[PDB]
Amino acid sequence: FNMQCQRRFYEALHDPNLNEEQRNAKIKSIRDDC
Amino acid sequence: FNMQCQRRFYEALHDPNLNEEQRNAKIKSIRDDC
Amino acid sequence: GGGPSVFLFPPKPKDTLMISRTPEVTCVVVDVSHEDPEVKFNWYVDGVEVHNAKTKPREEQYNSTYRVVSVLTVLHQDWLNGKEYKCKVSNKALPAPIEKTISKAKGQPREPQVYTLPPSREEMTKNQVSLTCLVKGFYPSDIAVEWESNGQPENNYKTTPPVLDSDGSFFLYSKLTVDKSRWQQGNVFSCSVMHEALHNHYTQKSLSL
Amino acid sequence: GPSVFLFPPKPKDTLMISRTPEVTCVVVDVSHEDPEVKFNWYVDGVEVHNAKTKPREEQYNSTYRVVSVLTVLHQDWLNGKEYKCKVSNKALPAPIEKTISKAKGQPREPQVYTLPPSREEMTKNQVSLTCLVKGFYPSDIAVEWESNGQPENNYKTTPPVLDSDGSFFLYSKLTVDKSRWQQGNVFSCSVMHEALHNHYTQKSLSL
Ligand SMILES: *[C@@H]1O[C@H](CO[C@@H]2O[C@@H](C)[C@@H](O)[C@@H](O)[C@@H]2O)[C@@H](O[C@@H]2O[C@H](CO)[C@@H](O[C@H]3O[C@H](CO[C@H]4O[C@H](CO)[C@@H](O)[C@H](O)[C@@H]4O[C@@H]4O[C@H](CO)[C@@H](O[C@@H]5O[C@H](CO)[C@H](O)[C@H](O)[C@H]5O)[C@H](O)[C@H]4NC(C)=O)[C@@H](O)[C@H](O[C@H]4O[C@H](CO)[C@@H](O)[C@H](O)[C@@H]4O)[C@@H]3O)[C@H](O)[C@H]2NC(C)=O)[C@H](O)[C@H]1NC(C)=O
Numbered sequence: 001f002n003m004q005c006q007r008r009f010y011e012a013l014h015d016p017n018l019n020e021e022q023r024n025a026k027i028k029s030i031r032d033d034c
Numbered sequence: 035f036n037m038q039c040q041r042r043f044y045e046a047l048h049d050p051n052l053n054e055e056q057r058n059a060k061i062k063s064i065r066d067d068c
Numbered sequence: 069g070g071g072p073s074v075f076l077f078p079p080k081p082k083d084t085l086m087i088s089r090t091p092e093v094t095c096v097v098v099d100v101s102h103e104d105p106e107v108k109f110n111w112y113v114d115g116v117e118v119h120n121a122k123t124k125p126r127e128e129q130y131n132s133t134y135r136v137v138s139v140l141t142v143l144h145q146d147w148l149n150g151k152e153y154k155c156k157v158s159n160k161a162l163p164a165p166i167e168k169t170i171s172k173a174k175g176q177p178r179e180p181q182v183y184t185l186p187p188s189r190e191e192m193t194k195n196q197v198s199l200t201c202l203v204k205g206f207y208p209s210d211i212a213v214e215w216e217s218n219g220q221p222e223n224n225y226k227t228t229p230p231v232l233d234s235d236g237s238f239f240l241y242s243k244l245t246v247d248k249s250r251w252q253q254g255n256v257f258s259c260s261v262m263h264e265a266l267h268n269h270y271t272q273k274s275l276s277l
Numbered sequence: 278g279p280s281v282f283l284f285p286p287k288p289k290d291t292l293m294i295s296r297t298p299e300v301t302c303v304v305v306d307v308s309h310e311d312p313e314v315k316f317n318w319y320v321d322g323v324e325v326h327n328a329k330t331k332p333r334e335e336q337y338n339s340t341y342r343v344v345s346v347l348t349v350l351h352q353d354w355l356n357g358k359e360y361k362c363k364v365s366n367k368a369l370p371a372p373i374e375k376t377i378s379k380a381k382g383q384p385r386e387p388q389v390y391t392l393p394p395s396r397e398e399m400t401k402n403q404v405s406l407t408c409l410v411k412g413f414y415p416s417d418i419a420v421e422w423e424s425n426g427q428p429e430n431n432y433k434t435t436p437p438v439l440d441s442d443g444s445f446f447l448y449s450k451l452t453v454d455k456s457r458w459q460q461g462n463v464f465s466c467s468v469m470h471e472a473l474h475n476h477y478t479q480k481s482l483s484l
Pocket residue numbers: 073075077078079080083091092093094096098099129130131133135
């Protein structure tokens with residue numbers, strides 16, 4: 001697996017600055033990449 | 035759990051000197067004993 | 069929702085291997101109705117009817133059905149030599165009697181290899197440590213594992229179920245948890261294994277610092 | 278009438294962003310006469326319409342089997358959303374409902390220990406490398422092995438076992454040629470769990 005995408009996913013999962021839609025949007029973005 | 039009793043049971047189980055009725059009798063004796 | 073269901077269970081591995089214990093086959097009937105509560109059991113050993121079974125009193129379940137159990141005591145040597153045990157169940161709700169048969173796993177037995185593994189260096193930071201027993205290469209999967217120390221049983225252990233290995237044999241692990249101080253003091257711990265392919269059905273491996 | 282069973286996603290699928298986790302609703306004992314089955318899916322009580330439903334399959338006991346698959350968001354499953362499958366069939370007097378979600382309770386981080394082969398085993402052509410994973414909750418976990426930046430395939434893992442303190446443990450066993458072990462090659466046990474940083478950790482083992 002790609003370590004970079006896994007790291008980004010985990011950060012977004014636990015990012016205190018985001019609400020659910022913002023978190024969902026960010027994770028969706030990460031998923032599109034690698 | 036007695037070591038001696040396990041040995042008697044196992045040998046009797048695989049004893050080439052006995053038929054089914056004799057082995058059943060020997061195993062019951064051991065069972066009565068242990 | 070008419071028609072009870074029958075399940076047939078083998079003896080415990082330890083009960084068949086130790087002469088001091090009593091192995092039994094268990095026939096369980098579920099979904100017995102309040103309208104048709106009477107259940108009759110007929111038992112057969114290699115096709116010959118036997119009469120020494122004991123029937124348990126009926127028990128009510130949360131879903132308002134009955135559960136009925138019949139227990140047949142068997143000879144150790146009979147089970148180990150592969151005799152077949154048959155339970156035949158009759159109840160009015162059934163169009164025909166239900167029959168189930170079981171016997172010991174077939175095939176050439178293979179003796180377990182038993183290895184003990186000390187705690188990891190990483191784990192010594194904890195108040196308690198893990199002692200490991202690896203048991204591999206055995207067939208069939210019927211096996212029992214226990215731990216002892218100083219001629220006394222140890223109780224704080226757990227054993228994984230048998231797992232099919234790539235070569236068609238089985239393996240498992242058993243984990244004993246002890247106070248670190250007991251390990252550091254040099255106390256000796258023993259992993260006991262019981263299987264039909266072992267001499268005297270029994271082997272023991274020790275573990276200490 | 279028919280019976281319904283609802284199954285969770287695979288542990289690795291919920292933890293790795295490269296994977297796609299799904300919940301599976303299975304309907305058994307569907308008759309030849311009333312083969313039409315209807316699925317309504319809900320996520321925390323909100324109806325969703327993106328499920329993928331397969332055509333019925335006839336079974337060995339002459340009944341039909343029908344399956345519906347709902348893809349779920351990783352973060353939704355991990356954050357404890359409830360998934361409900363509601364099945365309608367005319368043979369049923371009323372619809373059957375099943376609900377599942379991630380196990381509740383405080384997550385606990387797995388402790389990972391690698392154990393070398395026993396001295397007794399060094400008499401063999403092949404040897405066993407052991408990975409002990411303990412003290413974790415919930416029971417969803419995945420374990421893999423690698424060496425020299427390549428996956429090792431000759432391993433088997435026990436299912437999770439409930440420990441005395443309410444947490445879980447398991448063992449994983451990798452079998453290797455004794456010569457590779459003695460060569461000083463480094464082997465790594467990889468573990469994935471929700472309580473780990475990045476859902477991933479690795480422990481090494483060598484002579
Ligand atoms: C009404 O409610 C009934 C009970 O209540 C329910 O119980 C549980 C199970 C759950 O469903 C709850 O919702 C509810 O409270 C219910 O009855 C069940 O009916 C199903 C129907 O299939 C049965 O299903 C499976 O049964 C087999 C496994 O049973 C063992 O393991 C169960 C747990 O895993 C356990 O609950 C069982 O009691 C049974 O336990 C074993 O019992 C034996 C006998 O005592 C033990 O061995 C003997 O006992 C001594 C030790 O005390 C001694 O050692 C002796 O020598 C030894 O011989 C044994 O140790 C013990 N083991 C364990 C682990 O506990 C399973 O194999 C079977 O699979 C077969 O059938 C399937 C068909 O569905 C096939 O697909 C499959 O391939 C395979 O062929 C079943 O999957 C279930 O067992 C029943 N439960 C009970 C408690 O009896 C009923 O269905 C409900 N009715 C309705 C209409 O809803």
